[PDB]
Design a binder for this molecule. Structure first.
Ligand SMILES: CC(=O)c1ccc(OCC(=O)O)cc1
Length: 165
């Protein structure tokens, strides 16, 4: 079960951890992927989760895209969690480095509300280019279900906890 998390609010918890390693340990009902609209799991959280599934997540995702077309920025889809979780909720946060609308971060987090408990990264953080402090603020103000945030970077984790309002 979820261990070593710091409680931020009634429903938001945070831990300095590799989300892939957290997923293998807990095998949560839902692990959130920091997806793009094409479900191309190239780098960041997506690349790491996909690599831990031995590329099964990418093969499954390519079949999903062939059938359904791309996701919307702010949107999501539920696919298999493979060896990591029961399900993977692929959530598309805005990628500021791709010139996408940061104002869509709240819509992206609203997807978490369809799941009672989730293991997740901070949306639009890392290679998506948004301010992770702002992403945690939107998470806390949008997500009402139990979210266990895994922040990979130790210095970022400390900065997020120490600056949390
Ligand atoms: C050994 C094992 O149980 C295993 C499970 C899943 C693996 O990749 C993900 C998938 O195939 O969907 C690889 C290995």
């Amino acid at each position: 079960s979820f261990s070593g998390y710091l409680k931020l609010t009634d429903n938001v918890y945070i831990k300095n951890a590799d989300i892939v390693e957290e997923a293998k340990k807990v095998k949560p009902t839902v692990v959130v992927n920091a997806a793009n609209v094409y479900l191309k799991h190239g780098g960041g959280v997506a690349g790491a989760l996909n690599k831990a599934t031995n590329n099964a997540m990418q093969v499954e995702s390519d079949d999903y895209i062939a059938t359904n077309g791309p996701l919307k920025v702010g949107g999501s889809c539920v696919l298999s969690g493979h060896n990591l979780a029961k399900h993977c909720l692929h959530v598309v946060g805005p990628n500021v480095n791709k010139g996408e609308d940061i104002q869509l971060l709240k819509s992206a987090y609203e997807n978490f509300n369809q799941h009672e408990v989730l293991l997740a990264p901070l949306l639009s953080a890392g290679i998506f280019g948004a301010d992770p402090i702002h992403s945690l603020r939107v998470c806390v103000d949008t997500v009402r279900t139990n979210v266990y945030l895994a922040v990979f970077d130790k210095n970022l984790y400390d900065k997020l906890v120490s600056s949390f309002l």
